[PDB]
Amino acid sequence: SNEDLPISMENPYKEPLKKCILCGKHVDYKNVQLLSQFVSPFTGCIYGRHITGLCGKKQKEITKAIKRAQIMGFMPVTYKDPAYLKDPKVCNIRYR
Amino acid sequence: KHLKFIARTVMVQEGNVESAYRTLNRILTMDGLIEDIKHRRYYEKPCRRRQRESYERCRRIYNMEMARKINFLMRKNRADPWQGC
Amino acid sequence: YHEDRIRAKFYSVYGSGQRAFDLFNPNFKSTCQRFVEKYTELQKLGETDEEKLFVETGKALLAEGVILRRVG
Amino acid sequence: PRYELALILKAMQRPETAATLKRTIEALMDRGAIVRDLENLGERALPYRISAHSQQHNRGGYFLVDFYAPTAAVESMVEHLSRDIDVIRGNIVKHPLTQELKECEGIVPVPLAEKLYSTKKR
Amino acid sequence: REVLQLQEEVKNFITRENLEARVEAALDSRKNYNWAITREGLVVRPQR
Amino acid sequence: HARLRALNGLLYKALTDLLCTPEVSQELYDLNVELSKVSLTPDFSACRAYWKTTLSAEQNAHMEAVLQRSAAHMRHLLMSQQTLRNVPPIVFVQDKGNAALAELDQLLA
Amino acid sequence: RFMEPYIFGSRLDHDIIDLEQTATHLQLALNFTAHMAYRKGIILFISRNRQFSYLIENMARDCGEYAHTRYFRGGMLTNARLLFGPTVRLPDLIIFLHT
Amino acid sequence: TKFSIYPPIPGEESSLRWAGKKFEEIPIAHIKASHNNTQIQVVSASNEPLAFASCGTEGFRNAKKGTGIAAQTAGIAAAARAKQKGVIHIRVVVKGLGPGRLSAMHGLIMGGLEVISITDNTPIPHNGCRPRKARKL
RNA sequence: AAGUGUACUGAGUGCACUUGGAC
RNA sequence: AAACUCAGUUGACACAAAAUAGACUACGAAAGUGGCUUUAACAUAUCUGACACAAUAGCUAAGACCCAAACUGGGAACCCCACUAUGCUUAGCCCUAAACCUCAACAGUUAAUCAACAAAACUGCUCGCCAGAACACUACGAGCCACAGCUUAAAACUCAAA
Numbered sequence: 016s017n018e019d020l021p022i023s024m025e026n027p028y029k030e031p032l033k034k035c036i037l038c039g040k041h042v043d044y045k046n047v048q049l050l051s052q053f054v055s056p057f058t059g060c061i062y063g064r065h066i067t068g069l070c071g072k073k074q075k076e077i078t079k080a081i082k083r084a085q086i087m088g089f090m091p092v093t094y095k096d097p098a099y100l101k102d103p104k105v106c107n108i109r110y111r
Numbered sequence: 112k113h114l115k116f117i118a119r120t121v122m123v124q125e126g127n128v129e130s131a132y133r134t135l136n137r138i139l140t141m142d143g144l145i146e147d148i149k150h151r152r153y154y155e156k157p158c159r160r161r162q163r164e165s166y167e168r169c170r171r172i173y174n175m176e177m178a179r180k181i182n183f184l185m186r187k188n189r190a191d192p193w194q195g196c
Numbered sequence: 197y198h199e200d201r202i203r204a205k206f207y208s209v210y211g212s213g214q215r216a217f218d219l220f221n222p223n224f225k226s227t228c229q230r231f232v233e234k235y236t237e238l239q240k241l242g243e244t245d246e247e248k249l250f251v252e253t254g255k256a257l258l259a260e261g262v263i264l265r266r267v268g
Numbered sequence: 269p270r271y272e273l274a275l276i277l278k279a280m281q282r283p284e285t286a287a288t289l290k291r292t293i294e295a296l297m298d299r300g301a302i303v304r305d306l307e308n309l310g311e312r313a314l315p316y317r318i319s320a321h322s323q324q325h326n327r328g329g330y331f332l333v334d335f336y337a338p339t340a341a342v343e344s345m346v347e348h349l350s351r352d353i354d355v356i357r358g359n360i361v362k363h364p365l366t367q368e369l370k371e372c373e374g375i376v377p378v379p380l381a382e383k384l385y386s387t388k389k390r
Numbered sequence: 391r392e393v394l395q396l397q398e399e400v401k402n403f404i405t406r407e408n409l410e411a412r413v414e415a416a417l418d419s420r421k422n423y424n425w426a427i428t429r430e431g432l433v434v435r436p437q438r
Numbered sequence: 439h440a441r442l443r444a445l446n447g448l449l450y451k452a453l454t455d456l457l458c459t460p461e462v463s464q465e466l467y468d469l470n471v472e473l474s475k476v477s478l479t480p481d482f483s484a485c486r487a488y489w490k491t492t493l494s495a496e497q498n499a500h501m502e503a504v505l506q507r508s509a510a511h512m513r514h515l516l517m518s519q520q521t522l523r524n525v526p527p528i529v530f531v532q533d534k535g536n537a538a539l540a541e542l543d544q545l546l547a
Numbered sequence: 548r549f550m551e552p553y554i555f556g557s558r559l560d561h562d563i564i565d566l567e568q569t570a571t572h573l574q575l576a577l578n579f580t581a582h583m584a585y586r587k588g589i590i591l592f593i594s595r596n597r598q599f600s601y602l603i604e605n606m607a608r609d610c611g612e613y614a615h616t617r618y619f620r621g622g623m624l625t626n627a628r629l630l631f632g633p634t635v636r637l638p639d640l641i642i643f644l645h646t
Numbered sequence: 647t648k649f650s651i652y653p654p655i656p657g658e659e660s661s662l663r664w665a666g667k668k669f670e671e672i673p674i675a676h677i678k679a680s681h682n683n684t685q686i687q688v689v690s691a692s693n694e695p696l697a698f699a700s701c702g703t704e705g706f707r708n709a710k711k712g713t714g715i716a717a718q719t720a721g722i723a724a725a726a727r728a729k730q731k732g733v734i735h736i737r738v739v740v741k742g743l744g745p746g747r748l749s750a751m752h753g754l755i756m757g758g759l760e761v762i763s764i765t766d767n768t769p770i771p772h773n774g775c776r777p778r779k780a781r782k783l
Numbered sequence: 784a785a786g787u788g789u790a791c792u793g794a795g796u797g798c799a800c801u802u803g804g805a806c
Numbered sequence: 807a808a809a810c811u812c813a814g815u816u817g818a819c820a821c822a823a824a825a826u827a828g829a830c831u832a833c834g835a836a837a838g839u840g841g842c843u844u845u846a847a848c849a850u851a852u853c854u855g856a857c858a859c860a861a862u863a864g865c866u867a868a869g870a871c872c873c874a875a876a877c878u879g880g881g882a883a884c885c886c887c888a889c890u891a892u893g894c895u896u897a898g899c900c901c902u903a904a905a906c907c908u909c910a911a912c913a914g915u916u917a918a919u920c921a922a923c924a925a926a927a928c929u930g931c932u933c934g935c936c937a938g939a940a941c942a943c944u945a946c947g948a949g950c951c952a953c954a955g956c957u958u959a960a961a962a963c964u965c966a967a968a
């Protein structure tokens with residue numbers, strides 16, 4: 016009929032979802048070097064999702080991994096282990 | 112059963128113990144430990160704790176929305192570009 | 197429109213470049229518009245593969261002299 | 269199914285540790301497990317002091333006995349590890365590789381909070 | 391295909407025949423599971 | 439009234455403890471406010487917290503503004519701590535009684 | 548909601564007004580306005596867009612018809628008789644440059 | 647080298663020293679700051695009691711104990727005792743939230759002991775003893 | 784602060800629950 | 807004040823409770839469920855529809871008893887001190903909560919809004935429930951009890967209100 020009729024199609028300009036830094040990467044309860052990144056250096060308190068910038072699934076996975084490591088003796092409970100202080104800062108925190 | 116002095120320890124810089132203590136207290140407040148201590152001085156019944164947490168979440172969201180609205184509409188405060196009309 | 201796919205891919209591959217939009221000229225045609233036209237004529241030729249159409253359109257416009265600067 | 273036994277052993281000499289590991293694998297086989305593989309994460313200082321068998325230790329050797337066993341064998345394995353003295357601490361978990369890595373497209377968008385306030389004409 | 395791969399793996403499992411040799415080899419060796427992640431999702435394997 | 443006096447003492451201690459930390463706010467904590475006393479209205483309609491003023495006028499104004507902005511949050515924190523089941527609105531009042539003594543001693547010197 | 552029939556579609560979450568419908572509606576509206584002008588009725592241009600207040604006032608003065616772009620006192624039409632006088636003649640047609 | 651606020655790692659070759667003594671070796675000044683008392687104990691790295699002080703010891707009675715001046719006096723007395731014992735540097739570790747929490751350190755410094763590290767050890771129970779119900783007035 | 788259930792005491796208290804209250 | 811001669815560090819150390827995550831809103835029919843591991847495991851037609859459960863409290867027998875705490879006692883109902891039932895485990899009972907999202911299940915709709923407030927308004931379909939207030943979560947009888955209580959539940963008299 017008329018070739019200029021707008022067509023029914025999905026958005027091509029839509030951008031892919033912002034994958035969380037851990038999305039598609041398997042969290043493990045033995046990767047203390049990783050879990051340390053998501054706990055408070057001075058107290059060992061687990062950072063909330065509003066600080067870790069992680070989706071619900073991976074936030075829960077990190078929480079469970081941290082608890083499992085702590086109870087099984089892989090991770091200190093009351094502090095980020097000093098060996099991992101130089102690791103990249105992946106939590107939006109402004110102590111200083 | 113942990114190692115001592117690794118938790119909640121701050122090294123004083125040049126002896127400004129006041130500044131170091133302020134930093135330590137800031138750390139405690141940021142991690143909420145002071146909240147926990149002063150709340151655990153007495154026992155909040157589970158019903159009261161649930162009500163308080165719901166109220167806190169509602170107030171947090173309301174404040175966030177109000178601040179966002181204020182920031183969004185602040186730009187219009189610019190002097191009137193059509194004065195005299 | 198069907199050409200929206202081409203526009204999206206061109207923006208992804210080369211960005212907005214430098215030929216800023218002169219929105220006042222109704223007959224204005226940008227680099228993305230030129231790419232869309234060349235893609236359409238290439239498809240009409242008989243070539244049907246999408247990726248081949250895209251790459252050959254880029255090369256053809258390069259030959260035409262278009263500075264198809266790559267965004268990334 | 270496929271289990272992983274994380275084992276923290278009292279830090280001590282090579283012949284001793286080999287004997288303890290052999291005894292543990294013997295216990296697993298008696299309990300019917302098909303020991304898959306043995307891994308060693310080395311010795312290191314325990315994150316926090318752990319007491320066991322009228323004693324406390326600060327350094328331990330970490331190992332991961334991956335195996336397959338009938339479900340019933342797990343309780344017996346736990347009891348055996350608890351009774352053993354050379355084991356600072358033994359835990360048994362469902363082997364992580366068993367769980368499938370369900371793929372997430374990413375972070376889904378966050379709309380306005382779900383009906384946290386009324387819709388009436390107010 | 392799954393069972394075929396499993397068959398291959400079983401040849402490398404632990405048996406009483408190779409029990410002691412495998413135990414000693416594991417003792418000599420050392421596996422590592424630690425690795426951090428940057429802000430951009432880059433795995434940073436730790437040098438030993 | 440003895441009950442009112444006890445309430446004033448408890449509220450003074452609680453407010454001092456609150457201000458000891460950034461719990462209310464880092465901005466408030468940095469100001470290092472010192473409370474002179476606490477007085478409850480006879481009907482329990484208000485709680486006046488008398489805070490000592492500094493010499494700097496701009497500092498006094500800023501401290502007053504921050505205190506007024508944080509009074510409600512402090513009230514909520516108290517009622518959450520259960521230091522008092524019900525706390526009336528908190529009003530921060532400047533205290534300047536010590537200025538007379540200070541300037542006396544200055545002149546007498 | 549009520550502008551859905553007139554909206555041609557959405558382009559990147561921006562509505563596009565169907566210019567065919569706009570052309571028909573503008574034809575009808577201009578025709579009606581011209582008819583009222585020919586019948587010598589009173590046409591009043593109303594709009595509270597301060598960006599175009601000056602332009603609208605000048606256009607009204609040029610065309611002879613009247614304009615009201617400033618703040619709209621309550622009842623300037625409902626209570627027109629008391630606000631203006633018993634014999635006041637009310638506008639025979641209004642044109643909302645901004646509704 | 648740029649300063650750091652984390653404590654030195656025990657069993658690590660840290661060039662930092664104080665009169666040649668290593669951080670772990672430095673005596674520890676426990677400070678318990680309760681609601682109605684403040685107690686200080688400087689103890690050797692082997693936790694040998696080197697000096698002890700409190701508001702009760704300094705004589706402040708009942709309410710007067712919970713005062714910054716009382717805490718300062720306790721700190722000064724403990725500092726004098728520790729100095730007589732031969733102490734110079736001290737690692738301050740504090741628990742509780744008593745009013746003399748900072749005045750104790752103030753008095754200790756005024757008495758002449760160099761605080762090298764301020765540490766907290768507040769007994770925060772994850773979940774244990776159920777606390778008593780809330781007062782009411 | 785109010786109230787529901789429940790129990791002691793002689794209106795309060797104890798435990799849990801609800802906001803049909805305030806922050 | 808009363809009370810203890812006990813207090814601080816360090817070490818050992820639970821049959822109690824389960825920071826942070828949790829700003830998440832998931833599981834379960836409901837009550838409820840937020841320490842870790844393992845096992846078992848989360849009914850169903852592709853509709854609705856009376857034996858089994860039922861928080862806290864309470865009782866029986868035996869254990870545990872850090873801490874908290876009706877009651878008691880002491881100190882100057884409310885405040886402070888100590889302590890008991892009880893909160894806990896086992897094995898049995900009782901079956902009531904503002905047991906509430908105070909909004910029954912299932913299917914469907916957004917077409918024309920509607921006492922008011924509350925959680926926008928409705929349609930179909932089924933079961934349960936109500937016919938002014940108080941008398942009255944009461945009496946009588948009955949069931950459960952195993953005797954001090956719960957469930958069921960009235961009447962008379964009164965009023966023009968509630």
Ligand code: FES
Nearest residue numbers: 035038372374375
């Ligand atoms: S965003 Fe995909 S797993 Fe976290």
Ligand SMILES: [Mg+2]
Nearest residue numbers: 853854855911
């Ligand atoms: Mg049915």
Ligand SMILES: [Mg+2]
Nearest residue numbers: 855856933934
């Ligand atoms: Mg039923």
Ligand SMILES: [Mg+2]
Nearest residue numbers: 860861900901
């Ligand atoms: Mg029950």
Ligand SMILES: [Mg+2]
Nearest residue numbers: 871890891892
């Ligand atoms: Mg008891």
